[PDB]
Amino acid sequence: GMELPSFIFQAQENLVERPWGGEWIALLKGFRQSGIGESWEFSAHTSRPSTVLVKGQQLSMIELFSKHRDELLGRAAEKFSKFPILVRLIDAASPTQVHVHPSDKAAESLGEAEGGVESAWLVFNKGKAYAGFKEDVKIEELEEKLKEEDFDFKTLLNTFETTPYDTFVIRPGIPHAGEGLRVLEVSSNSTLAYFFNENDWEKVKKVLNTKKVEEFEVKGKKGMAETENFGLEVVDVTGTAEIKTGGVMNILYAAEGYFILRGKETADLHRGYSCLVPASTDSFTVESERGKIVRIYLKV
Numbered sequence: 001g002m003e004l005p006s007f008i009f010q011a012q013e014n015l016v017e018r019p020w021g022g023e024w025i026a027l028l029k030g031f032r033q034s035g036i037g038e039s040w041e042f043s044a045h046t047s048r049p050s051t052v053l054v055k056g057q058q059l060s061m062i063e064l065f066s067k068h069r070d071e072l073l074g075r076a077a078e079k080f081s082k083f084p085i086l087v088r089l090i091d092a093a094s095p096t097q098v099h100v101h102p103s104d105k106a107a108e109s110l111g112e113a114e115g116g117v118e119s120a121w122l123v124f125n126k127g128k129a130y131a132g133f134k135e136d137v138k139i140e141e142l143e144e145k146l147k148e149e150d151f152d153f154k155t156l157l158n159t160f161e162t163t164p165y166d167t168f169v170i171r172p173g174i175p176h177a178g179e180g181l182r183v184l185e186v187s188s189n190s191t192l193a194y195f196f197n198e199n200d201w202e203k204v205k206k207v208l209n210t211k212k213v214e215e216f217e218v219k220g221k222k223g224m225a226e227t228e229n230f231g232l233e234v235v236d237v238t239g240t241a242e243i244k245t246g247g248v249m250n251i252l253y254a255a256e257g258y259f260i261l262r263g264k265e266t267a268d269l270h271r272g273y274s275c276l277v278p279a280s281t282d283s284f285t286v287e288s289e290r291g292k293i294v295r296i297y298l299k300v
Ligand SMILES: OC[C@@H]1O[C@@](O)(CO)[C@H](O)[C@H]1O
Pocket: 095, 096, 097, 098, 150, 151, 152, 153, 154, 177
């Protein structure tokens, strides 16, 4: 199967308004607007599917995947029967509340319609990431804190003062939050998240890792992180660089600079935008005066 072009673009922006969102995302997408917390890039999530342009014609990621699944996934086609990932730009400008994701096992046990969530984070600025308890805690003592008006639960977590392109891997059960933080978050194709509040507390108790987590357990390498199912890497481009898909679906995000893309056809990519590369493209070149492009890939 090789019906698809090398480079598939979103037809329209897929943005999410959030009270904690600032101005960064709208600005990436060429306009001025506060209160945008998220941009969903090539979402095949049923709550919020992206729409794409294939050779100039418009369709949903969901349609695209049901029709072109084997070609899109390539060597990952046997491993994944549903669309494997969700890619989001996140502008956590105001502090988010502490939350936690279930594993596949926990989500199934809780009877959720969605699966578990693992995620890899690529940070773009100097902000604060919070991940894992810095000491052992007791569920009961966390519940005492819920009684207070607005106990800062982030004070109980490892605090990371970031620099651009720091990475994190947030595993199921790990409590986390961000503040003044611009981030690319590649996760499972699931949005299950339980916040530290009365409404979600019964779910939190069932999935929360209450043990001390060491910093090395949540920190990735500079510009590079992976789970067992997917990964991301920052490619520094000065001039022309050849990029290999590995015969699996890739997504490219232009973090800095302007790129000319040359595969089966020629295209370009502006800072703030993403490109979907089907597995049927073995390799292609990207060209930039000096830029940084993020390659997101499936692991098989
Ligand atoms: O000061 C902001 C407050 O702190 C928190 O992060 C608590 O963990 C909440 O998001 C917000 O209510």
